[PDB]
Write a protein that binds this DNA or RNA. Structure first.
Ligand SMILES: Nc1ncnc2c1ncn2[C@@H]1O[C@H](COP(=O)(O)OP(=O)(O)O)[C@@H](O)[C@H]1O
Ligand code: ALF
Ligand SMILES: [Mg+2]
Length: 509
RNA sequence: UUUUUUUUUU
């Protein structure tokens, strides 16, 4: 299919809510809802996408725009307009399906639809239901039946669950599907799900297999995503609407990025603690920050340390995929409203989540994928606000920083070294209540996460894996102590003949 | 001794 590039333009005419109303693109009812939100104007991605999405041209749309620049309303506004344009046709049926890679993001998008409803009660007739895992299936279906929604927001697993059973009842008249965080949804482990979803919707569509228009949105995408999305794009033309220059870095330029380089992975823990201590003092506890970590077990560990250090000064919130969904949703609601606090999380929170007025993003170690560096730091400096980010890594993780330069043109100007005092080490370690077995579990989770990104980040296996493993000895305050394991466990890892394995583990069988 | 997410509360 024919890809049509519409690159970034400097001196193009400003599109406004009024201009779109006057032009007949937007109806008064959606104009009213968005005007009442009192935004200074429409963001660049909103100006670029609203009219093309609503065009009668037989095309799909790909849109790229930086983190926090209003991509959500860029698709929600034209979706609502479509519902108004076709309001007397198939009025009890789902016309738009929006898919997101995390449950909390799907639920946030639903909350944004409700904000549109609250600014104009006349839009409540275009109802919305979320279909996400970790919620009661029957309760959600009762809501589908009661509200007969025109908009569904979903995560892939639960959507497939519902579609296998109820595609005929609600989904035979879909006109749009949206992949939010599109590049994430087309990686391995989501791509097959999106192809399943797309196939069902196309097969069940009452008009034709190519009726559905597909919209892809992300801060991180290019021409390669069209290839990955080939099996789910129906139309003969695809419009690529880009608000970022070809060679311009995808990271938001307003973020003051820095990197703090330690000799050892574990030292990044002490560096982050001292950094947070300094920010709390200098800002007089007026501090809202998000700190990312590589694994669930390490995130939980890091939370314990930060509570011991800082619970007297700020709330510390624990956010990852093993937190119950009820608690995930409640903590997201709280951290959205709170003026201060520290959110400690995995990449479950890297993309999409909009927590207003976060001052700083912190990272201990590397993200789960290169693109998530851009999204992680993009949790700050949203909707025209300022922000800073600090990457805490060890020397053996430096090839990640080089890959950011080579692959994404991201060059972090501020770089500094860190070495922990014996005082901070004692302070942090003495409060740790985890047993050795728990510490082993935590460090092993890190070994596995780092092993999976060696190729992508061009790490030296022989250096990074022993360094990560040595965290066990650092945390137990004995640097020659290796991780005690069995022979069969070493065999499962495939390291029973490796010198790398001998450096990491002691066969205490 | 589940590396980040992602149905199985259908
Ligand atoms: N036109 C606008 N002007 C200012 N802020 C906006 C505008 N549109 C949306 N926002 C706000 O910007 C924030 C980030 O939007 P979001 O859609 O989450 O960003 P993205 O999806 O591009 O990362 C939200 O709080 C949203 O309400
Ligand atoms: F691009 Al986003 F939250 F969707 F930063
Ligand atoms: Mg978004």
């Amino acid at each position: 299919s024919k890809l049509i590039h519409v690159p970034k333009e400097d001196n193009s005419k400003e599109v406004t809510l009024d201009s779109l109303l006057e032009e007949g693109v937007l109806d008064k009812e959606i104009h009213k809802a968005i005007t009442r939100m009192e935004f200074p104007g429409l963001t660049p991605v909103q100006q670029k996408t609203i009219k093309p999405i609503l065009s009668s041209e037989d095309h799909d749309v790909i849109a790229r725009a930086k983190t926090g620049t209003g991509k959500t309303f860029a698709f929600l506004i034209p979706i609502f307009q479509h519902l108004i344009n076709t309001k007397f046709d198939s009025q009890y049926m789902v016309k738009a399906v929006i898919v997101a890679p995390t449950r909390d993001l799907a639920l946030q998008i639903e909350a944004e639809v409700k904000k549109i409803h609250d600014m104009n009660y006349g839009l409540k007739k275009y109802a919305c239901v979320s279909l996400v895992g970790g919620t009661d299936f029957r309760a959600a279906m009762n809501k589908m039946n009661k509200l007969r929604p025109n908009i569904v927001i979903a995560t892939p697993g639960r959507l497939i669950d519902v579609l296998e059973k109820y595609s005929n009842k609600f989904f035979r008249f879909v006109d749009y599907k949206v992949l939010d965080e599109a590049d994430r949804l087309l990686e391995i482990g989501f791509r097959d799900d999106l192809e399943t979803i797309s196939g069902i919707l196309n097969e069940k569509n009452s008009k034709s297999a190519d009726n559905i228009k597909t919209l892809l949105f992300s801060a991180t995408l290019d021409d390669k995503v069209q290839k990955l999305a080939n099996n789910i794009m129906n139309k003969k033309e695809c419009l690529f609407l880009d608000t970022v220059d070809k060679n311009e870095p995808e990271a938001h330029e307003r973020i003051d990025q820095s990197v703090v380089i330690s000799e050892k992975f574990a030292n990044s823990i002490f560096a982050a603690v001292e950094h947070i201590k300094k920010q709390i003092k200098e800002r007089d506890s007026n501090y809202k920050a998000i700190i990312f970590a590589p694994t669930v077990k390490f995130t939980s560990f890091l939370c314990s340390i930060l509570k011991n250090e800082f619970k007297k000064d700020l709330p510390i919130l624990e956010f990852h995929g093993k937190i119950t969904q009820n608690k995930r949703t409640s903590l997201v609601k709280r951290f959205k409203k709170d003026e201060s606090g520290i959110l400690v999380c995995t990449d479950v929170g890297a993309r999409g989540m909009d927590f207003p007025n976060v001052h700083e993003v912190l990272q201990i170690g590397v993200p789960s994928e290169l693109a998530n560096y851009i999204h992680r730091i993009g949790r700050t400096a949203r909707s025209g606000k300022e922000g800073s980010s600090v990457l805490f890594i060890c020397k053996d993780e430096l090839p990640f920083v080089r890959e950011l330069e080579d692959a994404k043109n991201i060059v972090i100007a501020k770089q500094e070294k860190y070495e922990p005092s014996e005082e901070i080490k004692s302070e942090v370690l003495e409060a740790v209540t985890e047993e050795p077995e728990d510490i082993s579990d935590i460090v092993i989770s890190l070994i596995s996460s780092y092993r999976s990104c060696i190729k992508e980040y061009r790490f030296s296996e022989r250096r990074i894996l022993p360094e990560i493993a040595s965290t066990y000895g650092v945390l137990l305050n004995d640097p020659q102590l290796k991780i005690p394991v069995s022979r069969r466990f070493l065999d499962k890892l495939g390291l029973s003949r490796s010198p790398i394995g001998k450096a990491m583990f002691e066969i205490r069988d």
